Amino acid sequence: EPSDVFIGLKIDQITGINQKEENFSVVGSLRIDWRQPLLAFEHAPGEPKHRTYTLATFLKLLEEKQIRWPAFTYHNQQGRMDFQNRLISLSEDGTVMYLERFTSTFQAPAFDFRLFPFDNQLFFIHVDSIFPQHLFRFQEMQGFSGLGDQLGEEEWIVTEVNTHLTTHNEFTKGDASRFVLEFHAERHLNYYLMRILIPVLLIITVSWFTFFLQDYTKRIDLAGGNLLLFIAFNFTISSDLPRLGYITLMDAFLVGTFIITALVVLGNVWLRRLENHGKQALARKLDIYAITSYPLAYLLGALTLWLLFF
Amino acid sequence: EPSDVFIGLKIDQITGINQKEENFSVVGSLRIDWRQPLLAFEHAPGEPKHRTYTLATFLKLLEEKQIRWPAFTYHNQQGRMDFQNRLISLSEDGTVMYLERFTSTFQAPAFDFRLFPFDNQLFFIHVDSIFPQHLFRFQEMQGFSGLGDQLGEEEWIVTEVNTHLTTHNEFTKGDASRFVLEFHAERHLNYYLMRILIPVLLIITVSWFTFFLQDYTKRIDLAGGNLLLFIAFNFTISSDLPRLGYITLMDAFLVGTFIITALVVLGNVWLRRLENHGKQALARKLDIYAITSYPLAYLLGALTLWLLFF
Amino acid sequence: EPSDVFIGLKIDQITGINQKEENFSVVGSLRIDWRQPLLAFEHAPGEPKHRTYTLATFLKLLEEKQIRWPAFTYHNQQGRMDFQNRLISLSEDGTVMYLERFTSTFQAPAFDFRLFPFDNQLFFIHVDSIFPQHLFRFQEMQGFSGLGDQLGEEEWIVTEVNTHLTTHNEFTKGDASRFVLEFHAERHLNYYLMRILIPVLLIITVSWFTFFLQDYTKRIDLAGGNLLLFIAFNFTISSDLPRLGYITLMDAFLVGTFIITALVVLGNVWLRRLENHGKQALARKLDIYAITSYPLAYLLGALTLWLLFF
Amino acid sequence: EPSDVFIGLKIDQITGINQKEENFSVVGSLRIDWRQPLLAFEHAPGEPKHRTYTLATFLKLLEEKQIRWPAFTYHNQQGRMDFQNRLISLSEDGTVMYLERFTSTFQAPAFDFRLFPFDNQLFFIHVDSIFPQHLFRFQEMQGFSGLGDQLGEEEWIVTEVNTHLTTHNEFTKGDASRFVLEFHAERHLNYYLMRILIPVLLIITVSWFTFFLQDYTKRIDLAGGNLLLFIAFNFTISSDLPRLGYITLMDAFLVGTFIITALVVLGNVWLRRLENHGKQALARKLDIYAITSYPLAYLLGALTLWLLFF
Amino acid sequence: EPSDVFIGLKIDQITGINQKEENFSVVGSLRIDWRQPLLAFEHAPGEPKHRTYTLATFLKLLEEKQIRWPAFTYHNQQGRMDFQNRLISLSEDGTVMYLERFTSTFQAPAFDFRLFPFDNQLFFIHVDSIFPQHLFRFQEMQGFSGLGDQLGEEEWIVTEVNTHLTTHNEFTKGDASRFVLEFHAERHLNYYLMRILIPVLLIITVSWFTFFLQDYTKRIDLAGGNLLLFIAFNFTISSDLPRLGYITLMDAFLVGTFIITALVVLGNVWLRRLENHGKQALARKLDIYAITSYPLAYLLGALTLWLLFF
């Protein structure tokens, strides 16, 4: 018959979310409650009713007593799991109380940058039983699982936390227990507003101010240099994310500014070609279209992405 | 009844404060004094009154003697704690004298960048008893706790150090002991004065010198390029800090220079529009306002932030 | 006679492919099935038919019983192999069932950047028997080997996976068993299209728009600055790859743009030399060749590489 | 009575000096000679007079024999000390001969950048006895201590090495032994001459050549851009050092170039203001002062720092 | 009498050569054959003639039998040596067969950048006996030592490999054995040709094309900006190497381009001073010298370094 293994997982800290490598790092405490009647013991008066063991000697005790422990794996773990505490408290009953304090990076494969920077992501930790459900069954340890209140993450803001149990078939033919700690987090846009939106909007607006100078050559030089600035911002954005196989809302936004700037060069080349061909009065009358086109093109572009993505 | 566990924590070095990840790194010595009568021993003349043990065999001795040690955790620890020394000296009495020399990173969740770079921060180390206050009670080991005098930190300057004891309820129903080593540190502004204030002030002042040339086109080209420089400084600042969800005094300072520079372009576009419309004498009379506006705008801006943040 | 050792290797995650260092990193599970009759045991009613061991005590048991285990090496491994699980399940029969969960970097020496970014690469993991084929023979553990479905790699896309067995002669005179897990992966071009093709094409096209201004000096200044931009892109590409001893399709592409831009400067220097020597009407008639040359040169260049590499 | 512990420390390599973090890294061999009569032994003919032990079993032997070993700490150590060798050779006499080969980072708190890059620094390694001078006294192991001849450091050049003994009161009431290995090193200026002095001097000299063109507008544009170059060099320098609370000779040097460049803009604005107000012949006569001012200002500045710092 | 210790070292991979830190990283296999008659054993029919041990228990066996093992050190090792395999096979004879598979960084103190990038470097691994030549003598294990055929290094190309034995006096009075694995490697120049030579040559050639425009002011602006580009390339080169105390062929090359560019500004300032002083026909006749000087100066410079370094 299968023995109930009570899994509890609590994230104390989010040491960082690395979106370029699609992983996240946490400081967490794993808690297990497992009653093994075979491990029960007798005690003399004065002698303790609860025995405390370092994982090392407790496992040496299980091998001796020929007992199978609920061997588990953190399925989505990455690299080294640096441990702080691995402590066992065994009661007279045979109730094993295990605490595992660690720092570890976990894979974040649920990363969807399609709406970046206005994106909401799913982050999870998978705890899998190596032995199937006929031997061990994971149960939800009540009053422990979740996320702490001093996570130390500044960019991300956790919207909700969930815990559930499911099956997996990793090393076995039949179903094996899997404990899931899931959390959703959205982004603080302040960085993107201050470093990307405000600068890009300023470059466009203050470049439009110079249209009132009525110098087409000057506009051509300005739009040319503006295109270079946007190419630079394009590289600034690309450095934050992985080399995705799909277009970001941010990628569409930058390509958009490229197109408009390209056309601004094209248009003012045409107006300056009119001036050069003795048609200055004509280019000056058409100039109203060039001056009002610019804000409308960018405001039409903004409504195009907003429609194409929402 | 509960046994008194004497906690002492001394920071020898500050290997660095990483404000982008909101953590700090120290080289520290943990000292514990704990009297366990069960560990007491008898000795023959000439035989030692004090037994010295490597933590490994001392824990093997506690498991044998069925004794529970005051299992503790550095609550705000991050990653690997690299150890130097883990040594035990056990007296005939049963007084355990423990020394733990380590290098480790600790979470700094108290980070408030709102007044950066004129900010004062709180840094702490939390030492928690896994077992509740009915079993073990932490006490302040006198004549040890604090910070050394060769911390090796150059940017930060520690203003004060504090030690106190409090309860926590991390793994238990009832209160459990927590030792706290806290320190406040303010920043050395020399870097920000030399690399950010002096350059930004120079760019603004020497750009104002060229107003005396009375070439509005030249001013437009200058203010346009100045805006780009400030956008570059904006990225230089952003690289030091996390992607915060709030505005910094520094962020307000840069946005301030953007606004003024934007208006400088706007104003000189207007003056040059007057010259282009045969109103050169008028633009030259108004030029006194443009020349005196510039220093007043920046000096009004400086007083605006200083009021808005202080 | 030789004992059959059943090797199974499954990659759960691709934590990253580092093309600058020509290596890749995985989270993987190694599975071994090995029947050693000497390890067989007798059991009492109620006592388990399957004994579970930590690798540490299981090896201590093999040394005691004077049994030689199939000592193996991951031939192309690099750095530290961080382990998660090292668990043994021994049946009454003497069938050893081993599971090795790890995170590790592996050498990728098959890297051929000649057609980068349109390249397809081979990645493999080599599992070698230290002892020759007369002692141990590796066999393919059926229903396990391969790659998972949540690898978490965004740039690369795995085209096919293969498993085979071969000999090696690393530490022995005679042939020794080698298990191979191979996979082919091609690249997602979206990054290169968005950050390199679109910008380079835009710079060239919008620079051509200004030819319609009929200012040869302006073209010279433009082509000169364009050359600098391409030199900058050249450095952006070089940072992704190792310092190869061969030319990339990308390197040829950039050298191509250098040559055309160099000749654009040369041509427009000539046209401006005609204007300076009182031959303005002649330079204006020849200008049709200069304006139509530019798109033809770049379109001839594109067809040259495409032929030279395909 | 106290037992003499013979300390010897030899640095084989300087893997690097990190001046931004004020630490240094070495590959070193620690050698200890300690006579403990209690550890002495008897031997049969043929049996060895010298017993060789792995630190692990030798410490297990000391715990058994209830002997206190001279527990020591590398006081200024940082992070992980990666060990190569930890070997004990025990003679029939009871003379313990210990060798500790390691790679480790050590705090460099003696860093004084005030005269950077012409600075001389002190680097040391502190070896402290955990037990006081009444139990163990450190003595200088002769014919071992110092620095090797293939340190592999290219920027720094070790001027002298010293070894001495002093007391410390880290964990004890009374004085405890401390072994000190100190070395002084000065910097190779070639990098600073080639990358900072020569470029800055060239920018200034070749900018002065253009004064002979007699175009005040051109000088204003040149000095403005030069100021930007110096701001860039300012950031190049700041990246090598920590965010110090004091001024560097280098910081003074850069601030100096800012001031002169600021005044160059101011002066040429004045000369161009004379030309604009029909005073061209006057500005041309004063131009001798502007042309001779520039070299004198920079040569007066160079003598100002040289006096202010030497 | 001394016992022969057979050393064999084979490098499977070159994980990278870090020329900034003057070290290199390898994946290697160390092989030792050592006959210790004291370790010999008796066997019954059916019982094995060869005993297989994990280094841990084999060393525990040597301490028990009071046998001294040939304790060795990798003299030029750096940091952590991550081990894969540490396996012992002991024959009835007492022949110890040891295999050590590792990943490790090693000091490269032989680095001579004087002719960089046309340099050839020496890389080695030193294996030293802690015990002198009277106890243990290292011998060359034949048919093993060298370098593999899938080293995975792309920039460097190994020219030759050598193995030899020498003495050292590190911890001993008398000579102690040292095994040396040496290899010479030269560089693949393709990176330097594509990223440094071609761009620098293009900048110079296309800047010369503009001399045919006969605008001295334009040349001054061009040479000034070219100087800035070379200063940028100067920083690009400096980032690859340590802060050496000697001049590189590359450093001389960049300083060379600075000098010529400085003189180009000087010359064209003179020609433009002639034009400004009503001597346009004279400056135009001298212009032949200015136009032919430029290619000759650079071609004289190239022959100067080539003579000064070869």
Ligand SMILES: CCCCCCCCCO[C@@H]1O[C@H](CO)[C@@H](O)[C@H](O)[C@H]1O
């Ligand atoms: C930069 C946006 C500011 C708009 C206001 C116009 C003033 C001129 C700004 O400077 C110019 O900006 C161009 C585009 O970035 C560069 O090509 C050029 O070299 C530089 O002189």
Ligand SMILES: CCCCCCCCCO[C@@H]1O[C@H](CO)[C@@H](O)[C@H](O)[C@H]1O
């Ligand atoms: C810029 C701070 C120094 C002000 C002193 C005035 C002299 C000219 C300095 O060069 C200026 O640099 C800007 C940024 O690149 C360009 O936009 C601008 O067109 C260019 O003239």
Ligand SMILES: CCCCCCCCCO[C@@H]1O[C@H](CO)[C@@H](O)[C@H](O)[C@H]1O
């Ligand atoms: C950048 C190509 C955009 C084409 C549109 C034509 C307008 C001018 C763009 O500014 C150009 O930027 C270069 C940057 O290197 C400078 O060298 C060059 O003198 C300058 O004119």
Ligand SMILES: CCCCCCCCCO[C@@H]1O[C@H](CO)[C@@H](O)[C@H](O)[C@H]1O
């Ligand atoms: C620049 C150091 C070399 C001086 C030699 C004189 C020739 C002109 C050099 O080009 C200058 O490049 C700066 C880039 O920042 C611009 O700001 C400035 O307007 C421009 O004139």
Ligand SMILES: CCCCCCCCCO[C@@H]1O[C@H](CO)[C@@H](O)[C@H](O)[C@H]1O
């Ligand atoms: C860059 C070498 C190309 C040679 C062909 C001349 C075309 C103009 C290229 O733009 C130039 O860029 C330099 C660097 O910023 C400036 O100093 C210079 O005044 C500017 O005109």
Ligand SMILES: [Cs+]
């Ligand atoms: Cs963080």
Ligand SMILES: [Cs+]
């Ligand atoms: Cs585990």
Ligand SMILES: [Cs+]
């Ligand atoms: Cs602990």
Ligand SMILES: [Cs+]
């Ligand atoms: Cs210009």
Ligand SMILES: [Cs+]
């Ligand atoms: Cs292994």
Ligand SMILES: [Cs+]
């Ligand atoms: Cs990835």
Ligand SMILES: [Cs+]
């Ligand atoms: Cs520091």
Ligand SMILES: [Cs+]
């Ligand atoms: Cs020590």
Ligand SMILES: [Cs+]
């Ligand atoms: Cs070095």
Ligand SMILES: [Cs+]
């Ligand atoms: Cs060793």
Ligand SMILES: [Cs+]
């Ligand atoms: Cs490599």
